[PDB]
Design a protein around this ligand. Structure first.
Ligand SMILES: CC(=O)N[C@H]1[C@@H](O[C@H]2[C@@H](O)[C@@H](CO)O[C@@H](O[C@H]3[C@H](O)[C@@H](CO)O[C@@H](O[C@H]4[C@@H](O)[C@@H](CO)O[C@@H](O[C@H]5[C@H](O)[C@@H](O)[C@@H](O)O[C@@H]5CO)[C@@H]4O)[C@@H]3NC(C)=O)[C@@H]2O[C@@H]2O[C@@H](C)[C@@H](O)[C@@H](O)[C@@H]2O)O[C@H](CO)[C@H](O)[C@@H]1O
Lengths: 114, 426
């Protein structure tokens, strides 16, 4: 039971990023894991998930652009994010499904032009 | 201790949002629609429902346990747990060694602990087994559809040899069931319903054409009619199956051979599978708890829209008596989903170790049938689960992964209701 996201930052649109989450083995092992984001003025929205066998699935808002993967040997979860729009600006969070009720700190992703 | 709300919402900005949604009947009504839809996913759907998969999984693990070990489990004797001298008793449609029957023909030893299973206990086990297989084969209903039945579950056993009294049926007047062609009605309660069974007796002489035991025998047919197939019903049967095995705690002995996966221990007593049996029991118990959330969800529809009682703007402090209902519904849904997840985690070999892990991966979560429909007993069922245990874990996972949005909606609905409930005191 610990959740730690890193890898976020500020980018121009069309940029990509690789989010990481170190999860404790209690959380990770044998569990579906997933990514979430929380944009300003909105509540946490589910973004993606992936079974312990590696079957991914995604939210319509990000399908085609994002890729979720897991390293089962390192209790690690990743979100490869491409073609970033300003709409994807949010704190990103990782967790098992169903959720452990204490969330990690999350990692800030900010997308904005120029 | 915060003095005021702006200092409180500076720090926790999502809370500001949640208040804005609590004041906006169209947001509230959207949440209540979601609860409708996610409820349908949990209790109205089957393959996509974690709840459904978790129930199916608990049932399958109980069945598979017996499919794995029943052939190696020694059983015998006469009525009332007595030892017998030359009593052979055979239950049809059971995973025997290279057979679709289990023979119980161990004479002389007293049935009991670390001993043969009594025929009384087998009978009790077998009926639970026959009903579960029949239901698995017909496919289980959605959680809310708890009023259906299986038209017909039918099973037979046969008794032969000198002194064998296992096919003597007593009946409640105290009269024996007539042995050649007698046929009588019985009842029992299955989740609060009365189920009749037509029990019947046939004798077949030794010299009858193609009586292949060249020994005369009594065959007992049991025809249950309109057997309930609700979750709550089949879990109770599963519970009977595994608790029977566990309380009887018979001796068993498998021969391991070279090549395959390896049973540990090779011999002993069935209740020595403490870890396995505990988990199966825990799965069953948690599936019962989960199913009990169905009624809470049903008692609290969320399909009536909610508005500012009189055409005037919505007031969160007075217009929201629906909130206790909405909170309870969402909490019921969350609880189902957790329980569902708990069920898979109890048996999922990714978190297992030792001989328990080697039980599930080597045996329980395999099938040596050559893939036949669920509920199918063949001459290779023995020593493997044959109850879609891996496929069922995989699907529970897949169902849960495909419930990410729905789960977030439930949480949001719960906080919105909670928020209203608060405002609603005062
Ligand atoms: C009270 C009641 O209604 N039932 C209880 C009773 O059951 C036995 C009695 O009814 C006796 C009365 O004689 O009959 C047994 O059944 C008989 C049938 O009457 C008969 C009709 O087919 O066939 C007998 O079968 C023959 C046949 O199989 C040949 C072929 O090899 O072998 C016979 O036995 C051999 C013996 O094995 C040899 O060693 C030898 O020396 O020769 C004899 C032949 O003279 C065999 O008997 C049949 N008998 C048996 C023992 O099967 C009732 O037995 C029960 O019913 C049968 C059909 C089977 O289910 C048995 O396992 C049952 O026990 O008393 C019982 C206690 O033994 C139970 O309490 C019954 O409830």
């Amino acid at each position: 039971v610990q959740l730690q996201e890193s890898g976020g930052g500020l980018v121009q649109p069309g940029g990509s990023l690789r989010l990481s989450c170190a999860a404790s083995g209690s959380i990770f092992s044998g569990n579906v894991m997933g990514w979430y984001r929380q944009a300003p003025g909105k509540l946490r929205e589910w973004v993606a998930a992936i079974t312990p066998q590696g079957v991914p699935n995604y939210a319509d808002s990000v399908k085609g652009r994002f890729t979720i993967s897991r390293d089962n040997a390192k209790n690690m979860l990743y979100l490869q994010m491409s073609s970033l729009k300003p709409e994807d600006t949010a704190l990103y969070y990782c967790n098992r499904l169903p959720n452990y009720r204490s969330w990690g700190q999350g990692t800030q992703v900010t997308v904005s032009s120029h | 201790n915060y003095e005021n709300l702006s200092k409180l919402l500076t720090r926790y900005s999502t809370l500001n949002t949640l208040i804005k949604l609590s004041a906006d009947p169209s947001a509230i009504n959207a949440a209540r629609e979601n609860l409708g839809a996610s409820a349908k996913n949990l209790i109205g759907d089957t393959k996509n429902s974690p709840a459904y998969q978790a129930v199916l999984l608990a049932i399958n693990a109980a069945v598979g346990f017996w499919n794995v070990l029943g052939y190696a489990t020694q059983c015998g004797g006469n009525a009332n747990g007595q030892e017998s001298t030359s009593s052979t008793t055979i239950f049809n449609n059971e995973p025997g060694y290279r057979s679709t029957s289990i023979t119980c023909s161990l004479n002389r030893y007293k049935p009991g602990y670390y001993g043969p299973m009594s025929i009384e206990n087998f009978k009790k086990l077998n009926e639970a087994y026959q009903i579960l297989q029949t239901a698995l084969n017909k496919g289980l209903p959605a959680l809310k559809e708890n009023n259906g039945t299986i038209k017909d579950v039918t099973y037979s056993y046969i008794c032969y040899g000198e002194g064998n009294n296992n096919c003597e049926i007593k009946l409640a007047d105290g009269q024996k069931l007539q042995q050649n062609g007698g046929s009588e009605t019985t009842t029992q309660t299955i989740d609060g319903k009365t189920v009749s069974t037509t029990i019947s007796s046939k004798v077949v002489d030794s010299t009858a054409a193609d009586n292949t035991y060249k020994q005369s025998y009594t065959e007992i047919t049991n025809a249950l009619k309109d057997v309930p197939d609700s979750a709550q019903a089949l879990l109770a049967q599963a519970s009977t199956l595994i608790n029977t095995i566990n309380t009887a705690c018979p001796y068993f002995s498998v021969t391991n051979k070279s090549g395959g996966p390896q049973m540990e221990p090779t011999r002993g007593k069935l209740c020595g599978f403490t870890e396995e049996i505990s988990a199966i029991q825990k799965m069953i118990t948690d599936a019962q708890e989960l199913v009990n959330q169905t009624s809470v969800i049903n008692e609290h529809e969320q399909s009536t829209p909610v508005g500012g009682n009189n055409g005037k703007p919505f007031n969160p402090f007075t217009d929201a008596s629906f909130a206790q209902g909405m909170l309870a519904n969402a909490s019921a849904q969350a609880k189902m989903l957790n329980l569902a997840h708990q069920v898979g985690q109890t048996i999922n070999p990714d978190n297992l170790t030792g001989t328990f892990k080697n039980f599930v991966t080597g045996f329980l979560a395999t099938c040596n049938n050559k893939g036949s429909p669920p509920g199918t007993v063949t001459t290779q069922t023995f020593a493997s689960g044959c109850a879609y245990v891996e496929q069922t874990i995989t699907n529970l996972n897949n169902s849960i992964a495909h419930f990410g949005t729905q789960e977030q909606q439930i949480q949001q609905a719960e906080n919105i209701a909670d928020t209203l409930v608060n405002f609603g005191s005062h």
